Design a protein around this ligand. Structure first.
Ligand SMILES: [Cl-]
Length: 343
RNA sequence: UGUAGAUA
């Protein structure tokens, strides 16, 4: 029986097993649930660098077999941690040629994310130079999009320009990404971390198909990120459009959240535009909104976010309609969360 | 009364 089967039998019998004992058994240990846990715990608890170094040659020699293994990927990740700096460059060399495949794999992509989280900028750039070859497909991939998001989070903006240029590669790319469950997160991460020179054309593409993106199940989060991370002009354009089309935006499932974001993030003069649209003298828009399955939440958010003077206009506009509003689906509950304002 | 993203 080999070392692993012996060790798996009676762990207590081998309480003094060390990393340097593993030798050629590293691959078998690292792909085993028990063996991988042993390796990880020794790598975390050992005070002996030479013990830790002793399995590194076998990790390198078997890197392609370990990186997308259910248990082996954790062993590889240990050597990208702080404290294993001396091994980072050799380990990147061991995986670099297949990074374009690893980015799409569910275990290997965690190795790549760990590397980008920890290693120095020259090694990050080396990894990204391979991601370059598969970046469009990577952005829409359940696994690859997490590698791309980690890159945007952890690498200086000038070195993710190739990702921004992929968002801008054709007319429809930003739309395609914003309505994709994985691509939309890449767009959001870019809006959070890229420079305003990088985000300006990205935001410009979003504006061109604003209405469609704003009511998309994923795109509405992209638009909320524009409100938060865009320019004052971006918010003015958005608030002007929302105010001019307030009933339509408020009564649709996903775009209703965009109005709420405007009210949470907007300055008083933006809140004034939304309030004025809602109260404009059919019954006032704010009354119609309170009867609606989504817009009633937008009205509640308005009351919670605007100035006392702005609430005063809303109260004076709504109060005559309170009898008939009590009758609608949930209308008793809706006026109940507003009772504090109407007394 | 209303929304989202890969491991033992
Ligand atoms: Cl266009």
């Amino acid at each position: 029986d080999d070392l692993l089967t012996r060790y798996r039998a009676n762990p207590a019998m081998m309480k003094n097993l060390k990393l340097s004992d593993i030798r050629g058994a590293l691959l078998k240990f690292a792909k085993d649930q028990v063996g991988s846990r042993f390796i990880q715990q020794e790598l975390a608890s050992s005070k002996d660098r030479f013990e830790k170094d002793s399995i590194f040659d076998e990790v390198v020699s078997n890197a392609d077999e370990l990186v997308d293994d259910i248990f082996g990927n954790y062993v590889v990740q240990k050597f990208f941690e702080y404290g294993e700096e001396r091994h980072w460059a050799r380990l990147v060399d061991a995986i670099i040629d297949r990074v374009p495949e690893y980015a799409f794999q569910m275990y290997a992509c965690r190795v790549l994310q760990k590397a980008l989280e920890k290693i120095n900028e020259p090694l990050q750039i080396k990894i990204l130079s391979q991601i370059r070859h598969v970046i469009h497909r990577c952005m829409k991939d359940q696994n690859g999009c997490r590698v791309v998001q980690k890159a945007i989070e952890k690498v200086s903006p000038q070195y993710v320009q190739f990702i921004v240029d992929t968002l801008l590669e054709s007319s429809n790319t930003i739309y395609e990404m914003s309505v994709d469950p994985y691509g939309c997160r890449v767009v959001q991460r870019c809006l959070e971390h890229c420079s305003p020179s990088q985000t300006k054309p990205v935001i410009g593409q979003i504006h061109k198909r604003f209405d469609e993106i704003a009511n998309n199940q994923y795109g509405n989060y992209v638009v909320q990120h524009v409100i938060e991370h865009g320019s004052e002009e971006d918010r003015m354009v958005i608030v002007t459009r929302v105010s001019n089309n307030l009933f339509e935006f408020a009564t649709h499932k996903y775009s209703s959240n965009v109005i709420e974001k405007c009210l949470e993030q907007g300055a008083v003069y933006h809140k004034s535009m939304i309030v004025g649209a809602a109260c404009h003298h059919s019954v006032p828009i704010v009354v119609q909104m309170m009867k609606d399955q989504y817009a009633n939440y937008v009205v509640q958010k308005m009351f919670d976010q605007v100035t006392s003077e702005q609430r005063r206009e809303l109260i004076l506009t709504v109060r005559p309609h309170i009898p008939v509003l009590r009758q609608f689906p949930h209308g008793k509950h809706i006026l109940a969360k507003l009772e504090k304002y109407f007394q």
